[PDB]
Amino acid sequence: ADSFVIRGEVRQINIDYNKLPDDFTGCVIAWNSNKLDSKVS
Amino acid sequence: ASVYAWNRKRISNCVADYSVLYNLAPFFTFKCYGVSPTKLNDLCFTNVY
Known part of the structure; x- marks a missing residue:
């Protein structure tokens, strides 16, 4: 289980900027960071 | 431009x-x-709109 936050790049995982493509075998569990890891923005 | 009057470029x-x-x-x-x-940095095109 990896732990990263991207911009939105949500169509892909720009991100050659640190190689984890769609045909890599796995599941994507994802949600918005604007409710917990945020501010006004 | 608007949707009905979109500008050609x-x-x-x-x-x-x-x-x-x-x-x-x-x-x-x-x-x-x-x-x-x-791959767009390595391709060639006749024209781009």
Whole structure:
């Protein structure tokens, strides 16, 4: 289980900027960071 | 332009650099088909609209 936050790049995982493509075998569990890891923005 | 009166635009002879474009504020997305975002820097085109 990896732990990263991207911009939105949500169509892909720009991100050659640190190689984890769609045909890599796995599941994507994802949600918005604007409710917990945020501010006004 | 408006949707019904959209302006026609053709791009002429150009040495294109796309790596400076994808991080500009109006050019964040590339949700489409038929071209690749990591391959446009190596392709040649007859014209671009």
